[PDB]
């Protein structure tokens, strides 16, 4: 990456991706009766 080395607005020691962490019923026949 020469283009990423040439200009001065290209800092180093950059873990660019700054992030956070990551720590991790249908029924049938419900009948009745009345008799």
């Amino acid at each position: 990456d020469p283009k990423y080395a040439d200009l001065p607005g290209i800092a180093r020691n950059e873990p660019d991706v700054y992030e956070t962490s990551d720590l991790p019923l249908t029924s049938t026949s419900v009948e009745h009766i009345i008799v």
Partner: protein, 370 residues
């Protein structure tokens, strides 16, 4: 040629579509219409402004989705064709209208202008040669195997308790008061308004319907469970936040049996069905008292049918055989029932052929749909 027919279940909240012979309509998504909200300037976005399925579910709050079938009243005809086209697309059908027969569905009391309008679609825009359209209650009867049953569907805004006898729904006894959970969820949004939350966007309201289908049930005791203090179960927001539930999960569906909460001169599904019972043969009622045919997507609650049983107990007299016949694959039960009906061979007559439609159109349908 009469190829594999396509059973298309036009459920109020969720439309279903799939070839007959199958047991699952492989091509399903709810009954909606999704247009965007913003204007994509940069590329990397989809085009068409009518995004359905994974696009819709993907770009929920990005699309200002709407709903065509409003209690069985659909008005997005052109976009409906595009919805069918979306199914006709390589995504779902990959075939043509002319190539495969179509088994479309219906509801009672529908305006023949809209029905024949759909025939104009599948015979002019689309060119289905073998198209037959009918009720969804009979489809549920094919699923249950029962012939003398009172079918009541439960969609999002459609509830028609239709009493059928041997495959002959008595029109004098047919009850169609198509209104369901749509306004119940809207009234739950009113609860949220009385909690400080708005869900004016459809997708914003889709989450409400998701929790509605998820965190709700039927407390059999109406005012007893209503007057008792709820626990207000904190349910997770989709972003990662969390909000209470309250009585709403059972208080809002009380409106189904008590339509006066929304201020509507109705009587509650159970009483309407009893009215349907009254308009029949007394001896057949005892069968129908035990021929409780449940159907629709909104029949998925705890104590749902049991609270309904309590309603029947408050309605039906003693020594009355009551028997709930709940299905499990409710909306697809009708879809598979259509897969059964479309598999029939005598079935070739009453479907309006393309030439039959060319003959009269309107009256050819009128006489073939009746």
């Amino acid at each position: 040629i009469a190829n594999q027919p396509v059973v298309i279940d036009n459920g109020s909240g969720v439309i279903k579509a799939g070839f007959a012979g199958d047991q699952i309509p492989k091509y399903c998504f709810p009954n909606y219409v999704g247009r965007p909200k913003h204007v994509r300037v940069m590329a990397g976005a989809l085009e068409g402004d009518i995004f359905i399925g994974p696009k819709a579910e993907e770009h929920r709050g990005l699309l200002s989705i709407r709903y065509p079938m409003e209690h069985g009243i659909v008005k997005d005809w052109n976009d409906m064709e595009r919805i069918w086209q979306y199914v006709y697309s390589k995504d779902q059908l990959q075939t043509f209208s002319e190539e495969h027969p179509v088994l479309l569905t219906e509801a009672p009391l529908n305006p023949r202008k809209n029905r024949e309008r759909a025939a104009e679609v599948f015979f002019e825009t689309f060119n289905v040669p073998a198209l037959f359209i009918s009720m969804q209650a009979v489809l549920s009867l094919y699923a249950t195997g029962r012939t003398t049953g009172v079918v009541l569907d439960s969609g999002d805004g459609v509830t028609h308790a239709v009493p059928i006898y041997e495959g002959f729904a008595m029109p004098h006894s047919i009850m169609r008061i198509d209104i369901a959970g749509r306004d119940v969820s809207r009234f739950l949004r009113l609860y949220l308004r009385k909690e400080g939350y708005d869900f004016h966007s459809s997708s914003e309201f889709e989450i409400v319907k998701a929790i509605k289908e998820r965190a709700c049930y039927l407390s059999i005791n109406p005012q007893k469970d209503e007057t008792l203090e709820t626990e207000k179960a904190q349910y997770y927001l989709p972003d990662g936040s969390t909000i209470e539930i309250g009585p709403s999960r059972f208080r809002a569906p009380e409106l189904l049996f008590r339509p006066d909460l929304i201020g509507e001169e109705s009587e509650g599904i159970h009483e309407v069905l009893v009215f349907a019972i009254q308009k029949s043969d007394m001896d057949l009622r005892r069968t129908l008292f035990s021929n409780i045919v449940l159907s629709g997507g909104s029949t998925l609650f705890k104590g749902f049918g049991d609270r309904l049983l309590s309603e029947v107990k408050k309605l039906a007299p003693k020594d009355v055989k009551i028997r709930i016949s709940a299905p499990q694959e409710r909306l697809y039960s009708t879809w598979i029932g259509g897969s059964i009906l479309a598999s029939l061979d005598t079935f070739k007559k009453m479907w309006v052929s393309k030439k039959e439609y060319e003959e009269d159109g309107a009256r050819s349908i009128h006489r073939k749909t009746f």
